[PDB]
Design a protein around this ligand. Structure first.
Ligand SMILES: *Cc1c(COP(=O)(O)O)cnc(C)c1O
Ligand SMILES: *Cc1c(COP(=O)(O)O)cnc(C)c1O
Lengths: 379, 379
């Protein structure tokens, strides 16, 4: 045989103890770890369906919707995003994109690839979107879909949502919102803010492991996706298939692909936890924690990138890179000395993440103490 | 708030004990269960890279290749398939498809959607592909890629591979092979059989949980994918991105998407297990087990769908539905009474699956004893 058994693979697997306080993913609580270590069931069993059904109710609770087209995408953030775009947008269609960070910049790339006419409202890092600025683009381009990034995790910006859906609906437009870095860590009401496509990820404020995502579609969205001329470019992400399997339509569930059963156990639990906490409690915790963290960082003499506190994303705090330092040096120091992960921002600045169980005063202390030492030790 | 916490989610998660002896997925051995219950690490950490690197060596060992473009697709079977097609095929291109079951029939649907000229060599259930029949299609259509299903899990057929790659290479064609239901359970030598794209799944004979897949690309494939006019329809599955992240190219690893870390721990172990066993041992086990199972089924008076033993897939046995029975009745009886999953075949027949740790004489006994009772109790 050409290749021999890899020597490295013949040693036992060993992983460190890291406190993950970057934009994502987050650490796992015991219940989610426990779920991950369970045994398989049939991927098309009555029991597996029950679990999926339970998950659906959970996606409904956290999204605050009753949309019966709500389900899990067998993929990460980008897959839920891609899934949205490839099932809603037909080649030609006009797509209006809020390019504040990256997330917009990705939604763009996807749009371009599937042959959409892409309308990029570029705003420098830190910037958000004013309803008027939307209507001016909506007037200028007459799109079929707008994409807005709720929790902009590259810039630490919390986009205001209220009233945007009803603007979009007037111009016939569909609202797609990226709530991956916002869900569970700030107010969000899918049906009451009139959102047509909402998606989130498992590995941010729900404290499940990466590789699943939550998606929900309004009837307005459902119509546009169920009255395409053409078939979507992706079969894996074809909604008409997914919807059927996940039990959304009248037809009995027909095998499409194999769902990541063990991740679904985990996700189910992560949903049960925030269902036991309660959304408003979760939003309180994140709101307060964030508040504490800004105060502490302020004390160290660091400047918060997002100036207006009402525009700061609780879950992800952007901190301006202190003049005269190498960001790599600080971030590497932190992990190296204290065993704490703090990302940078992509497209610069320092990024810190309070997500679910990880969003406690203790963790803020810890990252503050760490950034302290580093500030006085980095060249 | 519109939606209240789902009452069902406020009870604790409870899953049955099922022996999964269908085409997939398979049951998990303790080491893989253990890996699934571990804590997160940074998705772009030195430690996470080591793990990915280790996995790569493992994909190289089981595929029997040295292709430095080998990596894990963050998706199931279909995603690795889709990933192959969307990165190799450009709209127009000619694609020659071995539509024996299904897997071909899906590769078709994908091909059509991404705007390939699709050439379907339909063969009734049970049928395989003769080198001549290939060359006649290769002559008739002059494709850029042929798709062959190695272990045809819908029909229980083992396709012969030997020499097909060198045929394909002569006509300038690329060989893509679906080894999801064959890898680890029959001989397969990527480089020595001249295969340009080989993919497999985690949830079949490797005994990892669903939701990851293994893919490898030859230099011939790499050239075609790295000299497209256009960008692939998918960003999630863009090889130039994936390749970079997974450390395949000269550029430092740049964030694309978030890899399903916990599934990667599992997959790493599943690879370590077959690296400790050794491929030829694994092929012996499956070969023998299969042999035993056919004998026993024969004794019950059941007829094996695939007549020629040299064409029977060890890992998945097709058994002709006995005249005068409802297949649903037998299959439901089996799970209902004995707690054993035995699928049907899609596009009919009964399907039984011996995959990795699950491929033992004991499990054959068990499914035989079960099918016995059912045969004499179903109407
Ligand atoms: C993390 C994140 C993503 C990316 O999701 P993946 O897990 O990388 O697929 C996208 N958008 C936002 C807002 C995020 O926070
Ligand atoms: C199971 C299987 C598939 C489907 O893979 P998914 O896990 O459903 O994405 C495809 N091909 C073969 C040969 C299989 O055995």
């Amino acid at each position: 045989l050409l290749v021999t058994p890899p020597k490295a693979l013949l040693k036992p697997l060993s992983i460190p103890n890291q406190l993950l306080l970057g934009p994502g993913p987050s650490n796992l609580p015991p219940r989610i770890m426990a779920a991950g270590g369970l045994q398989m069931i049939g991927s098309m069993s009555k029991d597996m369906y029950q679990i999926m059904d339970e998950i659906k109710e959970g996606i409904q609770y956290v999204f605050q919707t009753r949309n019966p087209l709500t389900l899990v995408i067998s993929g990460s953030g980008h897959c839920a995003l891609e899934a949205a775009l490839v099932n809603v947008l037909e080649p030609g269609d006009s797509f209006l994109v809020g390019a504040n960070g990256i997330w917009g910049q990705r939604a763009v790339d996807i749009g371009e690839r599937i042959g959409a006419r892409v309308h990029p409202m570029t705003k420098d890092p830190g910037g958000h979107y004013t309803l008027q600025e939307v209507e001016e683009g909506l007037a200028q381009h007459k799109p079929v879909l707008l994409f807005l990034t709720h929790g902009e995790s590259s810039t630490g910006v919390l986009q205001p949502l209220d009233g945007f859906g009803e603007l979009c609906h007037r111009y016939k437009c569909l609202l797609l919102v990226d709530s991956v870095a916002s869900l569970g860590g700030t107010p969000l009401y899918m049906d009451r803010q009139g959102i047509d496509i909402l998606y989130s990820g498992s590995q941010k404020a729900l404290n499940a492991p990466p590789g699943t995502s939550l998606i929900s579609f309004s009837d307005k969205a459902k119509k546009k996706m169920y009255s395409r001329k053409t078939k979507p470019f992706s079969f894996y992400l074809d909604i008409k298939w997914l919807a059927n399997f996940w039990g959304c339509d009248d037809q009995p569930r027909m095998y499409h692909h194999t769902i990541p059963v063990i991740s679904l156990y985990s996700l189910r639990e992560s949903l049960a936890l925030i269902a036991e906490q309660g959304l408003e409690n979760s939003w309180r915790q994140h709101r307060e924690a964030a508040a504490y963290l800004h105060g502490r960082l302020q004390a160290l003499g660091l400047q918060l990138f997002v100036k207006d506190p009402a525009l700061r994303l609780p879950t992800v705090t952007t901190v301006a890179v202190p003049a005269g330092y190498d960001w790599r040096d600080i971030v590497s120091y932190v992990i190296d000395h204290f065993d704490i992960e703090i990302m940078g921002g992509l497209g610069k600045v320092l990024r810190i993440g309070l997500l679910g169980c990880n969003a406690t005063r203790e963790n803020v202390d810890r990252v503050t103490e760490a950034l302290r030492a580093a500030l006085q030790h980095c060249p």
